[PDB]
Amino acid sequence: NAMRSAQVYRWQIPMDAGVVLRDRRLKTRDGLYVCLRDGEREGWGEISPLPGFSQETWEEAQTALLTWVNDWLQGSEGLPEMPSVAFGASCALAELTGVLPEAADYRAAPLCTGDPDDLVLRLADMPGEKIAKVKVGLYEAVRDGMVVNLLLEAIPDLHLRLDANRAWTPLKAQQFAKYVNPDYRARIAFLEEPCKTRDDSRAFARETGIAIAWDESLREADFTFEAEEGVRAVVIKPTLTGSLDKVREQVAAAHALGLTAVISSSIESSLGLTQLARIAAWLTPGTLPGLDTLHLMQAQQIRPWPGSALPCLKREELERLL
Ligand SMILES: [Cl-]
Ligand SMILES: [Cl-]
Ligand code: NA
Ligand code: NA
Fold first, then answer.
1. CATH topology of 1-98+298-322 equal to that of 99-296?
2. What CATH number has the domain spanning 99-296?
3. What domain of life is recorded for the organism?
């Protein structure tokens, strides 16, 4: 189409030392961007499969994105199934049509990074609603239970999101719970995927009174949105999910069941994170998104996250594929 043109960029962002995912060292974050133009209209997307979580590799995503772009340029925008590519391409399309609103709040649940005191100091005097995120299942269960307990004790109105990524056996999950004072358990907003199996996670929720959330379950073939005793939320990671339309359908299905839906990071670059902030403000206006992952990186690119002190690279500094 005479009116259409596109650009594709490839990049690698250095990570801070000490970032681990499913027994892996994420030394750099590797990804792609697409920039679509149709007349005076422009739209961007991020295509960044996450090692150990995405089925597709960076290299596979690159090929799929390029071939999708080739078709789009010729007037065919049907999206591929590959989730990171479907997500990025769909965001670019949504930006071209103005469907993705410009607005964002740019606030996220702060992520604990090994210093609960700092987290306490940061939240203890924050006016309004206090929500934070603690990763669990990396250290031994006793440690996690004590940390969670101390934080809840330190700030009486703090609500914690906990993320286990299916780390625990039923025994370890019970060991974690025993260190959390029952008087404080109601202030665990949710514990994402405590156990290795979903049935064990549900049993844990019912036994302990600690609310749970689904995250990786949503990407399993069998997944059905269900209201269930103990289940309070779902975590939706668009890069691992697919198109913006699919993300919308999932948010809607969760809300229709009274479940909280959290728009969440797959460690995207700043560009993708700002888009997730817009998606969250639009589709989940009442729910703080899980986007506090930028500080794990050494640079921003193209669009900065407001308030980040990290340097921001311009597009001219990235490797251009198309
Ligand atoms: Cl290549
Ligand atoms: Cl730029
Ligand atoms: Na636009
Ligand atoms: Na999670």
1. no
2. 3.20.20.120
3. Bacteria
Distance 310 CA to ligand 1 centre (A): 28
**Which has the closest alpha carbon to 321: 22, 103, 59?**
59
CB 65 within 8 A of CB 91: no
Fold exhibited by the domain 1-98+298-322? Enolase-like; domain 1 (3.30.390)
| Nearest alpha carbon to residue 186 among 249, 222, 230, 147 | 230
DSSP per-residue string spanning 205-245: HHHH---EEESGGGGSTT------TTEEEEEE-HHHH--HH
Report yes or no: 133 and 163 within 8 Å, Cβ to Cβ: yes
**3-class DSSP string for 61-106:** HHHHHHHHHHHHHCCCCCCCCCHHHHHHHHHHHHHHHCCCCCCCCC
The answer to whether the annotation marks 144 as part of a ligand binding site is no
Q: What's this structure's resolution in Å?
A: 1.9
- Breaks in the chain (C–N > 2.5 Å) following residue: none
Query: Distance (Å, rounded) from C-alpha 290 to C-alpha 229?
Result: 24
User: Does the annotation place 71 within a ligand binding site?
Assistant: no
Write out the E strands in the chain.
4-14, 28-38, 41-47, 130-135, 158-163, 188-192, 212-214, 231-236, 260-263, 300-301, 312-313, 319-320
Q: How was this structure determined?
A: X-ray
CB 80 within 8 A of CB 64: yes
Residues, Cβ < 5 Å to ion ligand 4: 163, 165, 192, 215
Sheet containing 28-38: give its strands across.
41-47, 28-38, 4-14, 319-320
The answer for residues whose C-beta is within 8 angstroms of residue 29's C-beta and 6 or more apart is 12, 13, 15, 48, 267, 269, 297
